[PDB]
Protein backbone atom coordinates (compact mmCIF):
# COMPACT_ATOMS: atom_id res chain seq x y z
CA UNK A 1 0.00 0.00 0.00
CA UNK A 2 0.89 3.68 -0.27
CA UNK A 3 -0.58 7.00 0.78
CA UNK A 4 -0.11 10.56 -0.51
CA UNK A 5 -1.50 13.69 1.17
CA UNK A 6 -1.03 17.39 0.54
CA UNK A 7 0.32 19.48 3.45
CA UNK A 8 -0.57 23.19 3.55
CA UNK A 9 1.02 26.08 5.49
CA UNK A 10 -1.24 27.39 8.25
CA UNK A 11 -0.29 31.04 7.59
CA UNK A 12 1.79 33.36 5.44
CA UNK A 13 5.00 32.60 7.41
CA UNK A 14 4.91 28.78 7.11
CA UNK A 15 4.70 28.59 10.90
CA UNK A 16 3.42 25.01 10.57
CA UNK A 17 1.78 22.75 8.04
CA UNK A 18 -1.54 20.90 8.25
CA UNK A 19 -2.48 17.67 6.53
CA UNK A 20 -6.03 16.30 6.39
CA UNK A 21 -6.53 12.99 8.21
CA UNK A 22 -9.65 10.80 8.19
CA UNK A 23 -10.57 9.35 11.62
CA UNK A 24 -13.44 7.01 12.37
CA UNK A 25 -16.46 5.65 10.55
CA UNK A 26 -18.01 7.58 8.89
CA UNK A 27 -14.83 9.60 8.39
CA UNK A 28 -14.22 12.67 10.49
CA UNK A 29 -11.59 14.79 8.72
CA UNK A 30 -9.24 16.72 11.01
CA UNK A 31 -6.27 18.85 9.94
CA UNK A 32 -3.23 17.59 11.84
CA UNK A 33 0.31 18.85 12.24
CA UNK A 34 2.57 15.97 11.13
CA UNK A 35 5.48 16.05 13.59
CA UNK A 36 8.63 14.00 13.01
CA UNK A 37 9.81 15.19 16.44
CA UNK A 38 7.09 13.46 18.51
CA UNK A 39 5.23 10.17 18.62
CA UNK A 40 1.62 10.84 19.73
CA UNK A 41 -1.40 11.16 17.44
CA UNK A 42 -3.67 13.42 19.50
CA UNK A 43 -6.74 15.41 18.57
CA UNK A 44 -9.10 18.05 19.79
CA UNK A 45 -12.21 16.13 20.72
CA UNK A 46 -15.72 16.12 22.22
CA UNK A 47 -13.84 15.55 25.53
CA UNK A 48 -11.68 18.70 25.29
CA UNK A 49 -12.49 21.32 28.00
CA UNK A 50 -14.96 23.60 26.16
CA UNK A 51 -13.11 26.85 27.16
CA UNK A 52 -9.93 25.43 25.50
CA UNK A 53 -11.58 24.90 22.08
CA UNK A 54 -11.68 27.99 19.78
CA UNK A 55 -12.47 27.09 16.16
CA UNK A 56 -10.78 23.68 15.90
CA UNK A 57 -12.57 20.73 14.34
CA UNK A 58 -13.11 18.04 16.97
CA UNK A 59 -13.10 14.25 16.88
CA UNK A 60 -16.28 12.79 18.48
CA UNK A 61 -15.62 9.11 19.21
CA UNK A 62 -19.29 8.46 20.09
CA UNK A 63 -20.15 9.21 16.40
CA UNK A 64 -17.64 6.63 15.09
CA UNK A 65 -18.85 3.05 14.75
CA UNK A 66 -15.21 1.84 14.82
CA UNK A 67 -14.05 3.81 17.90
CA UNK A 68 -13.26 1.82 21.05
CA UNK A 69 -12.07 3.22 24.38
CA UNK A 70 -8.57 1.96 25.17
CA UNK A 71 -9.58 1.29 28.74
CA UNK A 72 -7.32 2.77 31.41
CA UNK A 73 -4.94 4.43 28.95
CA UNK A 74 -3.94 8.08 29.45
CA UNK A 75 -1.44 10.37 27.82
CA UNK A 76 0.30 13.63 28.62
CA UNK A 77 2.88 15.44 26.51
CA UNK A 78 5.01 18.57 26.75
CA UNK A 79 6.72 20.03 23.68
CA UNK A 80 9.98 21.99 23.26
CA UNK A 81 8.02 25.28 22.97
CA UNK A 82 6.41 24.80 26.46
CA UNK A 83 3.04 23.70 25.04
CA UNK A 84 1.21 20.63 26.35
CA UNK A 85 -1.85 18.45 26.13
CA UNK A 86 -3.28 15.38 27.83
CA UNK A 87 -6.24 13.06 27.88
CA UNK A 88 -7.50 9.54 27.28
CA UNK A 89 -7.26 7.17 24.31
CA UNK A 90 -9.48 5.48 21.75
CA UNK A 91 -8.54 3.10 19.00
CA UNK A 92 -10.07 3.84 15.61
CA UNK A 93 -9.48 3.64 11.86
CA UNK A 94 -7.15 6.40 10.60
CA UNK A 95 -6.46 7.14 6.94
CA UNK A 96 -3.87 9.50 5.46
CA UNK A 97 -3.89 10.14 1.75
CA UNK A 98 -5.64 6.83 1.00
CA UNK A 99 -3.48 4.72 3.39
CA UNK A 100 -5.60 3.15 6.16
CA UNK A 101 -4.56 1.83 9.57
CA UNK A 102 -7.06 0.00 11.71
CA UNK A 103 -6.70 0.00 15.48
CA UNK A 104 -4.64 3.23 15.58
CA UNK A 105 -4.38 4.87 19.00
CA UNK A 106 -6.16 8.23 18.72
CA UNK A 107 -5.31 10.25 21.83
CA UNK A 108 -8.33 12.41 22.73
CA UNK A 109 -7.41 15.68 24.47
CA UNK A 110 -9.17 16.56 27.69
CA UNK A 111 -6.82 19.55 28.19
CA UNK A 112 -4.64 21.59 25.86
CA UNK A 113 -2.38 24.56 26.62
CA UNK A 114 -3.10 28.08 25.46
CA UNK A 115 -0.91 27.94 22.33
CA UNK A 116 -3.06 25.06 20.98
CA UNK A 117 -6.34 26.80 21.83
CA UNK A 118 -5.14 30.01 20.15
CA UNK A 119 -4.27 28.19 16.89
CA UNK A 120 -7.68 27.48 15.30
CA UNK A 121 -6.02 25.91 12.19
CA UNK A 122 -4.44 22.89 13.97
CA UNK A 123 -6.86 20.15 15.10
CA UNK A 124 -4.09 18.00 16.64
CA UNK A 125 -0.74 16.37 15.95
CA UNK A 126 0.30 13.20 14.17
CA UNK A 127 3.66 12.07 15.50
CA UNK A 128 6.19 10.44 13.17
CA UNK A 129 9.21 10.05 15.48
CA UNK A 130 9.98 6.59 16.92
CA UNK A 131 7.28 4.89 18.97
CA UNK A 132 9.64 4.74 22.03
CA UNK A 133 8.64 8.40 22.62
CA UNK A 134 4.87 7.74 22.68
CA UNK A 135 3.44 8.95 25.99
CA UNK A 136 0.46 6.57 26.41
CA UNK A 137 0.44 4.85 29.82
CA UNK A 138 0.40 2.13 30.96
CA UNK A 139 0.66 0.53 27.49
CA UNK A 140 2.78 2.57 25.05
CA UNK A 141 1.24 2.90 21.60
CA UNK A 142 2.64 2.87 18.07
CA UNK A 143 2.71 5.74 15.61
CA UNK A 144 0.63 5.74 12.44
CA UNK A 145 3.85 5.02 10.49
CA UNK A 146 4.88 2.12 12.68
CA UNK A 147 1.39 0.59 12.39
CA UNK A 148 1.34 1.12 8.58
CA UNK A 149 4.91 -0.04 7.94
CA UNK A 150 4.41 -3.75 7.33
CA UNK A 151 1.62 -2.95 4.75
CA UNK A 152 3.63 -0.32 2.83
CA UNK A 153 5.31 -1.08 -0.48
CA UNK A 154 8.58 0.29 1.07
CA UNK A 155 9.02 1.14 4.79
CA UNK A 156 9.44 4.87 4.21
CA UNK A 157 7.69 8.18 4.29
CA UNK A 158 8.81 11.42 2.65
CA UNK A 159 8.38 15.06 3.54
CA UNK A 160 8.26 17.59 0.72
CA UNK A 161 7.37 20.86 2.43
CA UNK A 162 6.66 23.98 0.38
CA UNK A 163 7.97 27.51 0.82
CA UNK A 164 4.86 29.65 1.08
CA UNK A 165 3.08 26.85 -0.81
CA UNK A 166 1.55 23.41 -0.31
CA UNK A 167 3.71 20.28 -0.32
CA UNK A 168 3.33 16.56 0.14
CA UNK A 169 3.71 13.72 2.63
CA UNK A 170 4.01 10.34 0.94
CA UNK A 171 3.96 6.96 2.65
CA UNK A 172 5.42 3.77 1.18
CA UNK A 173 7.12 5.11 -1.94
CA UNK A 174 9.70 7.64 -3.12
CA UNK A 175 8.33 9.97 -5.89
CA UNK A 176 11.35 10.20 -8.22
CA UNK A 177 9.67 13.21 -9.96
CA UNK A 178 9.64 15.28 -6.74
CA UNK A 179 13.40 16.01 -6.50
CA UNK A 180 16.42 16.86 -8.64
CA UNK A 181 19.72 14.97 -8.72
CA UNK A 182 20.20 12.07 -6.35
CA UNK A 183 19.16 11.38 -2.74
CA UNK A 184 22.03 11.33 -0.23
CA UNK A 185 21.35 9.01 2.72
CA UNK A 186 22.89 9.48 6.15
CA UNK A 187 22.90 7.46 9.34
CA UNK A 188 20.26 7.86 12.05
CA UNK A 189 20.55 7.29 15.78
CA UNK A 190 17.26 6.26 17.41
CA UNK A 191 18.77 6.47 20.93
CA UNK A 192 16.71 9.57 21.89
CA UNK A 193 13.64 8.48 19.85
CA UNK A 194 14.21 11.08 17.14
CA UNK A 195 15.32 11.10 13.51
CA UNK A 196 18.76 12.16 14.77
CA UNK A 197 21.60 12.53 12.28
CA UNK A 198 24.90 14.38 11.83
CA UNK A 199 25.30 17.14 9.26
CA UNK A 200 28.79 17.49 7.79
CA UNK A 201 28.98 21.29 8.02
CA UNK A 202 27.69 24.57 6.74
CA UNK A 203 28.30 27.64 4.64
CA UNK A 204 26.90 31.18 4.89
CA UNK A 205 25.96 32.75 1.59
CA UNK A 206 28.69 32.39 -0.99
CA UNK A 207 31.27 31.69 1.77
CA UNK A 208 33.51 28.68 2.06
CA UNK A 209 32.04 25.49 3.47
CA UNK A 210 33.07 24.72 7.06
CA UNK A 211 33.49 20.97 7.64
CA UNK A 212 32.17 20.29 11.15
CA UNK A 213 29.88 17.61 12.63
CA UNK A 214 26.48 18.97 13.75
CA UNK A 215 24.28 16.39 15.41
CA UNK A 216 20.59 17.28 15.26
CA UNK A 217 17.08 16.06 14.56
CA UNK A 218 14.88 16.27 11.47
CA UNK A 219 11.73 17.80 12.99
CA UNK A 220 8.79 18.79 10.79
CA UNK A 221 6.96 20.03 13.89
CA UNK A 222 9.50 22.79 14.60
CA UNK A 223 9.26 25.95 12.49
CA UNK A 224 12.85 27.21 12.60
CA UNK A 225 16.44 25.96 12.24
CA UNK A 226 18.17 25.77 15.64
CA UNK A 227 21.96 25.34 15.49
CA UNK A 228 24.96 25.91 17.75
CA UNK A 229 25.63 29.48 18.81
CA UNK A 230 28.92 29.61 16.89
CA UNK A 231 27.16 28.70 13.59
CA UNK A 232 24.26 31.06 14.19
CA UNK A 233 26.57 33.98 15.09
CA UNK A 234 28.55 33.36 11.89
CA UNK A 235 25.32 33.56 9.85
CA UNK A 236 23.88 36.73 11.41
CA UNK A 237 27.28 38.49 11.32
CA UNK A 238 26.71 38.67 7.52
CA UNK A 239 23.49 40.74 7.97
CA UNK A 240 24.01 44.46 8.73
CA UNK A 241 22.19 45.42 11.89
CA UNK A 242 21.29 41.85 12.98
CA UNK A 243 21.52 41.19 16.70
CA UNK A 244 20.39 38.78 19.35
CA UNK A 245 17.55 40.36 21.37
CA UNK A 246 16.87 38.87 24.84
CA UNK A 247 13.62 40.96 24.90
CA UNK A 248 12.33 39.39 21.65
CA UNK A 249 13.84 35.93 22.30
CA UNK A 250 16.38 35.49 19.49
CA UNK A 251 18.09 37.05 16.51
CA UNK A 252 16.32 39.90 14.78
CA UNK A 253 17.37 41.81 11.71
CA UNK A 254 16.30 44.94 9.82
CA UNK A 255 13.32 44.24 7.66
CA UNK A 256 15.16 46.20 4.92
CA UNK A 257 17.86 43.49 4.72
CA UNK A 258 18.44 40.96 1.99
CA UNK A 259 19.38 37.71 3.77
CA UNK A 260 22.16 35.38 2.63
CA UNK A 261 21.49 31.73 1.96
CA UNK A 262 22.55 29.02 4.39
CA UNK A 263 24.00 25.69 3.24
CA UNK A 264 24.09 22.52 5.32
CA UNK A 265 25.99 19.33 4.52
CA UNK A 266 24.52 15.85 4.13
CA UNK A 267 27.54 13.62 3.65
CA UNK A 268 29.32 15.07 0.59
CA UNK A 269 26.08 16.67 -0.62
CA UNK A 270 24.83 20.18 0.14
CA UNK A 271 21.33 21.59 0.73
CA UNK A 272 20.96 25.31 0.16
CA UNK A 273 18.35 27.24 2.14
CA UNK A 274 17.60 30.46 0.20
CA UNK A 275 17.83 33.67 2.22
CA UNK A 276 14.13 34.36 1.83
CA UNK A 277 13.32 31.14 3.73
CA UNK A 278 15.07 32.65 6.80
CA UNK A 279 12.78 35.73 6.96
CA UNK A 280 9.96 35.34 9.52
CA UNK A 281 8.74 38.90 9.15
CA UNK A 282 8.07 41.71 11.62
CA UNK A 283 8.39 40.85 15.29
CA UNK A 284 5.08 42.62 15.92
CA UNK A 285 2.68 43.98 13.45
CA UNK A 286 4.15 47.01 11.58
CA UNK A 287 7.65 46.72 13.14
CA UNK A 288 10.78 47.25 11.06
CA UNK A 289 12.55 44.57 13.12
CA UNK A 290 12.15 41.12 11.58
CA UNK A 291 12.56 37.73 13.24
CA UNK A 292 15.24 35.37 12.01
CA UNK A 293 14.66 31.82 10.89
CA UNK A 294 18.02 30.54 12.11
CA UNK A 295 18.30 30.65 15.93
CA UNK A 296 20.64 29.31 18.59
CA UNK A 297 19.98 25.87 20.04
CA UNK A 298 22.12 26.72 23.13
CA UNK A 299 19.07 26.87 25.51
CA UNK A 300 17.44 23.59 24.04
CA UNK A 301 19.99 20.75 24.48
CA UNK A 302 19.63 19.58 20.81
CA UNK A 303 20.07 21.05 17.34
CA UNK A 304 16.85 21.03 15.32
CA UNK A 305 16.57 20.91 11.55
CA UNK A 306 13.04 22.28 11.53
CA UNK A 307 10.87 23.40 8.63
CA UNK A 308 13.25 26.21 7.53
CA UNK A 309 15.81 23.54 6.65
CA UNK A 310 13.53 20.68 5.64
CA UNK A 311 11.45 22.73 3.19
CA UNK A 312 14.64 23.31 1.12
CA UNK A 313 14.87 19.54 0.51
CA UNK A 314 13.00 16.40 -0.43
CA UNK A 315 13.45 14.34 2.75
CA UNK A 316 13.22 10.55 3.05
CA UNK A 317 12.46 9.06 6.45
CA UNK A 318 13.64 5.48 5.91
CA UNK A 319 12.11 3.19 8.55
CA UNK A 320 13.86 0.01 7.48
CA UNK A 321 15.40 -2.23 10.18
CA UNK A 322 18.37 0.18 10.17
CA UNK A 323 16.72 3.62 9.78
CA UNK A 324 18.35 6.30 7.67
CA UNK A 325 17.49 9.82 6.43
CA UNK A 326 17.79 10.91 2.82
CA UNK A 327 18.03 14.43 1.44
CA UNK A 328 17.74 15.63 -2.13
CA UNK A 329 17.59 19.09 -3.63
CA UNK A 330 14.35 20.01 -5.43
Coordinates of N, CA, C and O in Angstrom, one line a residue, residues 101-105 131 141-151:
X101 N -5.0 2.7 8.4 CA -4.6 1.8 9.6 C -5.8 1.6 10.4 O -6.4 2.5 10.8
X102 N -6.0 0.3 10.7 CA -7.1 0.0 11.7 C -6.4 -0.1 13.1 O -5.3 -0.5 13.2
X103 N -7.2 0.2 14.1 CA -6.7 0.0 15.5 C -5.7 1.0 15.8 O -4.9 0.8 16.8
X104 N -5.6 2.2 15.2 CA -4.6 3.2 15.6 C -5.1 3.9 16.9 O -6.2 4.2 17.1
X105 N -4.1 4.1 17.8 CA -4.4 4.9 19.0 C -4.6 6.3 18.6 O -3.7 7.0 18.1
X131 N 8.4 5.2 18.0 CA 7.3 4.9 19.0 C 7.8 4.8 20.4 O 6.9 4.9 21.3
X141 N 1.9 3.1 22.9 CA 1.2 2.9 21.6 C 2.2 3.2 20.4 O 3.1 4.0 20.6
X142 N 1.9 2.6 19.3 CA 2.6 2.9 18.1 C 2.1 4.1 17.3 O 0.9 4.4 17.2
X143 N 3.1 4.7 16.6 CA 2.7 5.7 15.6 C 1.9 5.2 14.4 O 2.0 4.0 14.1
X144 N 1.3 6.1 13.7 CA 0.6 5.7 12.4 C 1.6 5.1 11.5 O 1.3 4.1 10.9
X145 N 2.8 5.6 11.4 CA 3.8 5.0 10.5 C 4.2 3.6 10.9 O 4.3 2.7 10.1
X146 N 4.5 3.5 12.2 CA 4.9 2.1 12.7 C 3.7 1.1 12.5 O 4.0 0.0 12.0
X147 N 2.5 1.5 12.7 CA 1.4 0.6 12.4 C 1.2 0.3 10.9 O 0.9 -0.8 10.5
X148 N 1.5 1.3 10.0 CA 1.3 1.1 8.6 C 2.5 0.3 8.0 O 2.3 -0.2 6.9
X149 N 3.6 0.3 8.6 CA 4.9 0.0 7.9 C 4.8 -1.4 7.2 O 5.3 -1.4 6.0
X150 N 4.3 -2.4 7.9 CA 4.4 -3.7 7.3 C 3.5 -3.8 6.1 O 3.8 -4.7 5.2
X151 N 2.5 -3.0 5.9 CA 1.6 -3.0 4.8 C 2.2 -2.1 3.6 O 1.8 -2.3 2.5

